[PDB]
Design a protein around this ligand. Structure first.
Ligand SMILES: *[C@@H]1O[C@H](CO)[C@@H](O[C@@H]2O[C@H](CO)[C@@H](O)[C@H](O)[C@H]2NC(C)=O)[C@H](O)[C@H]1NC(C)=O
Ligand SMILES: *[C@@H]1O[C@H](CO)[C@@H](O)[C@H](O)[C@H]1NC(C)=O
Ligand SMILES: *[C@@H]1O[C@H](CO)[C@@H](O)[C@H](O)[C@H]1NC(C)=O
Lengths: 323, 171, 171, 323, 169, 325
């Protein structure tokens, strides 16, 4: 007799999926819901490149460590990259106060301009701005210092009361950093600043702090028994910052006008940076995906798939495959 | 589960390549496979929708996961680790179970379609054909290519063939 | 999907106003709509339960979301923003999918009820009525208002009418 | 031949829902699962009203800024409201130490009473309690000061060592605040307190701190080149607090007996406050709902629906609607 | 729902003890219950899988929940409380709903199996038996223990009995 | 009349277990499994086969400083978490702040190796200062005035307090925890009486740490009979690094320090549940949980590899079918 039969597709396929009732069911068609591929590159995020530090810390880079000016300084970045070899930072030993908060705040800026707040050539006529140099920060073989600060020292036999202000006319906020130096011994204090019993004061509308030298011998670090502490503040548009000192103040030379962004981060990685566009970035490489889940890395930056611990998330689209 | 796929229709057809569900006829003019275009098309639409839903409902914020803490900030460093792990455990569990549940339902969806295609046909032929089982119908009458297609799009004429059929069924 | 709603019964009835599922009779005494009270009532009970479940299982803590952080506390301020965004993303994704999955199942729930109401009837009449399709039965005998209601509550007397029916089934 | 038919309801309805397989399916009946309506008011939470500051900060309110005593001071609140115009705070410039923690701890109190720990009239017979007034804190046109503190100054030519204790007999904890003044110049220090080299000490059973004046000129704020720092501590029942000083201490006058609550918060908003009951409060208005989700505001106080990003969450109750 | 369990087959059998689904015959040689082994076994496999899935997919980190804060750290103490409470609300909600959704589906799964077992039989006998309703078939012919078993494993011989049946019909 | 009968059906039984579904509450089923762990063993156990440190009468503070009441404790070189009791009460017996105390307790949570040693031997370290009269009524031992075991309260010898200077290089290959104190007398008479020099100072230094301390002389309200105070400080000295102390008064000097290897995230539980020889993978303040199950309602604050805490009272999964006898 003539016959009509109802049936369903079967094919080549060897994809398997799991269901709640059965494991390893072969299906005709199927789609993976888990992104497991990255591009092995550090990319631009929302079309703007990261700041890449290479040899240096963030500390090394904003203080202006002598090794850190091989870096072309851009006015914009979407996140910051340090490498495992990012080693040049504070070359004169000391605390960098609220360092982590600085690195957070500096994560991502839409505008960033370096400028000379206190021009070296005309700012300090009663103090020595040239002998402020150390074996702890060497440059072309010679004793050197940070590019963005100046270590003032007495001129002849006098350290007169120093007093100096800056008003923020930049229209953005400006980041200013300074240091205070703690000699090893009384002989060193007197030798560098004359006045035993020196003090420093730094002030703005919101900031106010007095500093006194803590004279003692610490364990040798990069050949120094003294120490320098590093400080920073953000001066608001229209506000003024004033320095007053009778010794021990390592003075600002360059400061930074900037416009902070929002939440970005710092990645530490040896993945090479590329001209390359992404919307989700990890320390291993970028993820270009539509998919809701990834297992590449828990710590991402951008607009990212949710990180999961699974190795496969295969969704059935076709039917059970019965050849 | 609806009992059709790997059920009363025990196997699939590697021969039918242009769709997910269809027919195999055999008459006087020849034999062959033809996919049911309408219900195949409908299914690919709906399954496309399911995939797109699972993907496109994921609202995603621009955020930077990482945070850095100082040697005297282990507590908040650990607080921060607790939130990252907590999210890990909920997203992992949800994603795994979502996939398991939806797969189970997709397979049953297909089963349901096949079963409805079969019933769509039994409904039309009634006792003009013999249900052989295995999803096949044996006609009690000659059914040519035009007849075959009248079945495939729901326009089978039952009265047209009832006499011929009932002769072969009975006497 | 069970193949009834927008299936073999291709349309709904704006005429039936006192329930979700029911009947349309047409005999000698007149015609009209009547909702099936028992299965409608049962369905409104179970759907009420589904809604109440989705609402009432939400355990809710007294909490104050907002926190205030000083200018040297951007890290923890950002930690805090991470947790709020993390919760946003899971509650948004779960709510969306919960709605999607439940809707899909509510519609199939209804399809199932309709299909079972149909089969409850075919089961009773057997070959005393002709399955016309479109969810209609044509009686092979006279079926008055009392007969109609014997069907509606499951107490149809098959033997009572078998002779009358089988006479007409020949003719 | 007569006929029985099986069928299903259809109606007026134009509500649509989405399913995983299909978008925009018209259904007969339907319920929204997402609360999107608020009442545009700030209300009482668990039947007790918030503390509404108006013109002032919390700082200005607990210190007793002269602009802040238009406020009727209740002994109970469920949360605190500041407005975008809440501007009168510390009128003499300085840091308010652990301010944000104070605001957290003061969020919600079940009992709160202001009292005079150190009565002005009898507490300071050897120091001047009347000339401690400034252009930085003006009242009815005149120079004034905070109501809750007194700025003690030398009497004639002497500032004798001051020493004063309070034992907490209130049975609750008491909040005490005090300030320490940093003059602009030596001439001012001596002028106000006589003794160059003054100090202050404050102590309890758990608290101990020495303070020394930091004399220097800061940038002008509200016409001041000196500064004042504000401090606070919670003295436990039975414990004692003692103040010792040879100058620079701005002394407590009023303190606060209180019973802290639990986790409430501060909302900053210009939404008006109403006699009105709620269990969930947002900066935009209150949410009276049975539903599990809301898209009104992420930052709520009380027992709230979960915040989501969606615009509709319509649950089907009826069947597919087919006219 | 498939309409079988507490449906057109209105009750269960306390008498059938060796399986979840099965048969009750009554012929000339005696009567009794026998569980369908194949479909019972299949179901216990799948339901075991369901339980193991719900349990084994739970990835679990070594962690120490508790944190200690000092009297001047109420804010981060409260932050911490917020993350604990947040997790409590999402795990509670998901767990409750998970159980509700899976139970509904497990009951429907069983309904489906029973309905399919019934149709597997109606399919085979056709008009050699009368559908009585309640999931019973009355044979129009003699069906002994060997005939009964031919039905139970899908090898019923329809033509063999058609004449005998049609006479009685 | 009747032809042979074959019927299709399903199991029913004894069972009274009920489950809930989205559509129905309280449905009796044949077979069923609970998904929610609600039993604990009422004991404090070993986590990953290593026992917790149990402090008994003492704080962490009293235990690392070496409060005189705290050396009934056998000091193990390994622990998986720390237990204090509601009676853990002997801590800093001379009143003062313990700086970064909570951080210290976090860091000391769990150590895979821990060894106490004498960095500055009492007998030979301080030949120009008095190391025997550094004892107080605030810290009593066998009825007599005493002090912490792990620190020494150096005082002037005769009429002189010469500038003190003392270093230690970390040769232990692990990090070492060193603690010290600074003392703030009540009055100038006391300061001079104890250390001679009004205007004393203390300095402490490593490669990363540097801090100067000056005495804050004043009378505080009396605690354990004291009007002065002592502050307690600690730091972790990395392998190869050196720590130096310098002082002209007021320094309470280290005597014992601790070589150690920190673990990872453990925690401190405060509880009166007894500690047992007993193995677990999840620990709570009420008792241990030995379970395969994904959820528990015993306690929100657990340590180990745990089921997720939930607020529910039952989570019964149906395995069998609706039960209809
Ligand atoms: C920049 O960092 C480099 C390498 O990280 C330093 O070079 C080392 O200096 C040390 C310490 O003085 C010497 O003993 C070694 O000879 C150098 N080591 C290596 C690995 O090259 C250098 O001191 C840093 N300079 C600045 C200015 O930061
Ligand atoms: C109060 O606040 C106003 C407006 O915000 C400001 O102009 C005024 O000087 C303040 N005065 C005091 C005493 O705080
Ligand atoms: C230890 O604690 C008890 C309990 O109050 C106290 O009386 C005693 O003085 C304490 N001893 C030391 C040395 O702290």
């Amino acid at each position: 007799g003539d016959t009509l039969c109802i049936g369903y597709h079967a094919n080549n396929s060897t994809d398997t999926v799991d269901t709640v009732l059965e494991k390893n069911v072969t299906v005709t068609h199927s789609v993976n819901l888990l992104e497991d591929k990255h591009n092995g590159k550090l990319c631009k995020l929302r079309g703007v490149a990261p700041l890449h530090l290479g040899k240096c810390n963030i500390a090394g880079w904003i203080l202006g460590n002598p090794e850190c000016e091989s870096l072309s300084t851009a006015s914009s970045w979407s996140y910051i990259v340090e490498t495992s070899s990012s080693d040049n930072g504070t070359c004169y030993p000391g605390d960098f106060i609220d360092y982590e908060e600085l690195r957070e705040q500096l994560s991502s800026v839409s505008s960033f301009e370096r400028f000379e707040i206190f021009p070296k050539t005309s700012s300090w006529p009663n103090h020595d701005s040239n002998k402020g140099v150390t074996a702890a920060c060497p440059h072309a073989g010679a004793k050197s210092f940070y590019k963005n600060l100046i270590w003032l020292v007495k001129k002849g036999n006098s350290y007169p009361k120093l007093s100096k202000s800056y008003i923020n006319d930049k229209g953005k906020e400006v980041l200013v950093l300074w240091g205070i130096h703690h000699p090893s011994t009384s002989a060193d204090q007197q030798s560098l600043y004359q006045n035993a019993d020196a003090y420093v004061f730094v002030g703005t509308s919101k900031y106010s702090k007095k500093f006194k030298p803590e004279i003692a011998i610490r364990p040798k670090v990069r050949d120094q028994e003294g120490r320098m502490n590093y400080y920073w503040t953000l001066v608001e548009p229209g506000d003024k910052i004033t320095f007053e000192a009778t010794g021990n103040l390592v003075v600002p030379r360059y400061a930074f006008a900037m416009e902070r962004n929002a939440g970005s981060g710092i990645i530490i990685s040896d993945t090479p940076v590329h001209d390359c566009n992404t919307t989700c970035q990890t320390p291993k490489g970028a993820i270009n995906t539509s998919l809701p889940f990834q297992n590449i890395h828990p710590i991402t930056i951008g607009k990212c798939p949710k990180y999961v611990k699974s190795t496969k998330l295969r969704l059935a689209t076709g039917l059970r495959n019965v050849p | 589960l609806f009992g059709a796929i790997a059920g009363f229709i025990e196997g699939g057809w590697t021969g039918m390549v242009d769709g997910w569900y269809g027919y195999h006829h055999q008459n006087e003019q020849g034999s062959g496979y033809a996919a049911d275009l309408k219900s195949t098309q409908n299914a690919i639409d709906e399954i496309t929708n399911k995939v797109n839903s699972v993907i496109e409902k994921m609202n995603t914020q621009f955020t930077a996961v990482g945070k850095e803490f100082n040697h005297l900030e282990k507590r908040i460093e650990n607080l921060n680790k607790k939130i990252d792990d907590g999210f890990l455990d909920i997203w992992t569990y949800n994603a795994e179970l979502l996939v398991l549940l939806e797969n189970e339902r997709t397979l049953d969806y297909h089963d349901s379609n096949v079963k409805n295609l079969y019933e769509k046909v039994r409904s039309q032929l009634k006792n003009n054909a013999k249900e052989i089982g295995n999803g096949c119908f044996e006609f009690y009458h000659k059914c040519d290519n035009t007849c075959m297609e009248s079945v495939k799009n729901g326009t089978y004429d039952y009265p047209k063939y009832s006499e011929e059929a009932k002769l072969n069924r009975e006497e």
